[PDB]
Amino acid sequence: LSLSDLHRQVSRLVQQESGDCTGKLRGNVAANKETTFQGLTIASGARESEKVFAQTVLSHVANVVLTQEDTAKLLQSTVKHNLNNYDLRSVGNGNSVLVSLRSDQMTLQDAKVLLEAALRQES
């Protein structure tokens, strides 16, 4: 889906208070009500639709500079969640670029941060 409507769809779910839920994608984005975020991979239980959601978001932030504020947001997720999902490369000035994920899951709240960085860059 396009960058801005993926972001619309995710923001909407966050607004509905599903931010802590992992995202599921197969057309329209869905909030995972079933299982929680645990840093799963397909091999340890992540759903195929969770991996598509996580990788779709990753694909949309390729070479998108993340600010220290963005970064801080993510770090709160790693900490709130006890788990570090991101491989971020220090691009200097406290900024970062996301190069890869460490699981096949991604919470909607985190997707929103990243998708907004991407929109930012766009504009």
| Local structure of 21: helix, strand or coil | coil
Q: Count of domains in the chain?
A: 1
Long-range contacts of 74-77 (CB under 8 A, 24+ apart): 74/110, 74/113, 74/114, 77/107, 77/109, 77/110
| Residue 121 · residue 64 · CB < 8 Å | yes
- Classify strands 95-101 and 29-31 as parallel, antiparallel or unpaired: unpaired
Name the structure determination technique. X-ray
| Local structure of 105: helix, strand or coil | coil
Q: Which residues contact 106 (CB under 8 A, 6 or more apart)?
A: 22, 23, 37, 50, 53, 54, 57, 85
For residue 104, give its domain range.
Answer: 1-123
Q: Of all residues in the chain, what percent are helix, strand and coil, respectively (each to 5)?
A: 50, 20, 30
**CATH number of the structural domain spanning residue 76:** 3.30.1570.10
DSSP element (H, E) containing 121: helix 108-122
Stated in angstroms to one decimal place, the resolution of this structure is 2.0
Q: Given the structure tokens 């900490």, which residue do they identify?
A: 79
Q: Any idea what DSSP says for residue 66?
A: B
35 vs 96: CA distance, rounded Å: 30
Residue 31 CA, chain-centre distance (Å), reads 12
